[PDB]
Amino acid sequence: RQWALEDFEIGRPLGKGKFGNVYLAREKQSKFILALKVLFKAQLEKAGVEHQLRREVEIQSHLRHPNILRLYGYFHDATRVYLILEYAPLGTVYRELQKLSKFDEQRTATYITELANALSYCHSKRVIHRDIKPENLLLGSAGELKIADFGWSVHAPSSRRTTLCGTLDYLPPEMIEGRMHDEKVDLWSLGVLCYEFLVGKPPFEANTYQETYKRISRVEFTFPDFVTEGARDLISRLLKHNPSQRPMLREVLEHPWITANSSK
Ligand SMILES: Nc1ncnc2c1ncn2[C@@H]1O[C@H](COP(=O)(O)OP(=O)(O)O)[C@@H](O)[C@H]1O
Ligand SMILES: N#Cc1cc(-c2cc(C(=O)O)cc3[nH]ccc23)ccc1Cl
Ligand SMILES: O=C(O)[C@H]1CCCC[C@@H]1C(=O)O
Ligand SMILES: [Cl-]
Ligand SMILES: [Cl-]
Ligand SMILES: [Cl-]
Ligand SMILES: [Cl-]
Ligand SMILES: [Cl-]
Ligand SMILES: [Cl-]
Ligand SMILES: [Mg+2]
Ligand SMILES: [Mg+2]
Ligand SMILES: [Mg+2]
């Protein structure tokens, strides 16, 4: 029913967020292990992001998919808001990529398949994530990808602007430009992730914000020699300036490079 902080024993920090921290926690009666995303009311209020927090909570609450992190509940006290999340025990894809440097084709196709299944479910409800990046991709007990952090999620179509000075690396041209956008934004982010998984760095990475913006807007990227023909084909289809030219998620799931390398 109605949770309070006294119902949990808090453990180690699991990760740092923009508006507070995520902690491992145990519900006192059941001993059930979960993650508490803690946000500071004063920081949320100064930034004026309460409306986006309401969307994170309302959207994530109603999603039910094995590759989407569950949001079980929420509560608040005088200074903080607490999101009760499903705990992802194998950490982030971000950490996995720092350890391994780059992923082989099998691990990449498997993660892309899991991501495409999760996004296909979101898009069936016109929910667009818009913040698909390695730090927001968690790993379950079976090493399965779980999409998390619905902080920027909205119902499609939308023209809302997400980050003002944060990383642009995963954003499509229509989002960085402030244009109307839809489900196709997640398809572009899928292409950026596929490239980063195989190469170790996102395709439009640059020293400055303006140079990253320029690269994204002109779709300026090249492949290192080791990237195979099949991976180049899928990435080139996803990274199209025109969102209408981006494939459907069923086309990604049936791509010959995906079917040849996916774990299933
Ligand atoms: N349920 C979870 N299980 C494990 N680690 C988590 C969980 N949720 C978040 N984290 C960790 O905390 C970080 C921040 O959480 P996130 O929800 O993305 O916050 P923010 O909206 O501030 O980005 C993640 O990038 C990850 O490192
Ligand atoms: N549970 C919960 C929750 C609480 C707030 C909130 C409440 C108040 C309040 O009722 O006083 C003040 C606030 N300032 C920033 C957030 C915020 C927003 C979302 C959720 Cl999910
Ligand atoms: O910290 C959060 O969960 C969200 C609060 C609303 C604004 C966006 C923000 C985020 O995920 O970046
Ligand atoms: Cl605002
Ligand atoms: Cl380690
Ligand atoms: Cl919305
Ligand atoms: Cl140039
Ligand atoms: Cl241009
Ligand atoms: Cl070549
Ligand atoms: Mg995050
Ligand atoms: Mg977030
Ligand atoms: Mg990097």
Topology annotation, domain 3-91: Phosphorylase Kinase; domain 1 (3.30.200)
Domain boundary assignment for the chain: 3-91, 92-262
Cα(55) to centroid of ligand 10, in Å? 15
Cα(44) to centroid of ligand 5, in Å? 32
The tally of CA atoms less than 13 A away on the side-chain side of residue 260 is 10
Cα(51) to centroid of ligand 5, in Å? 37
Of all protein residues, whose CA lies closest to atom 15 belonging to ligand 2? 41
Same fold, 3-91 and 92-262: no
**Distance (Å, rounded) from C-alpha 55 to C-alpha 87?**
21
| Pair of tokens at residue 68 | 């989407």
- Among the bound ligands, the one closest to the CA of 55: 6
Contacts of 156 (CB under 8 A, 6+ apart): 123, 126, 127, 128, 181, 182, 183
Q: Tell me if 49 CB under 6 Å of ligand 3.
A: yes
Q: Which of 49, 133, 147 to mutate to test the pocket of ligand 3 (most atoms within 8 A of CB)?
A: 49
What string of DSSP letters covers 143-210? S-EEE---TT-EESSB-----SSS--TT--HHHHTT--B-THHHHHHHHHHHHHHHHSS-TT--SSHH
Cα(1) to centroid of ligand 4, in Å? 31
CA angle at 209 for the pair 118 and 37, rounded to the nearest 5°:
45
For 86-107, give one letter per residue: b (16+ CB within 10 A) or e: bbbebebbeebbeeeeebebeb
Q: Which of 44, 56, 76 to mutate to test the pocket of ligand 2 (most atoms within 8 A of CB)?
A: 76
Do 223 and 234 touch, CB atoms closer than 8 A?
no
**Distance (Å, rounded) from C-alpha 221 to C-alpha 120?**
26
**Distance (Å, rounded) from C-alpha 55 to C-alpha 59?**
6
Catalytic residue among 77, 104, 131, 233: 131
Q: Tell me if 105 CB under 6 Å of ligand 3.
A: no
Instruction: Say if strands 71-76 and 127-128 run parallel, antiparallel, or are unpaired.
Output: unpaired
Contacts of 238 (CB under 8 A, 6+ apart): 187, 188, 190, 191, 194, 246, 247, 252
- Experimental method reported for this structure: X-ray
Topology annotation, domain 92-262: Transferase(Phosphotransferase); domain 1 (1.10.510)
131 noted as active-site residue: yes
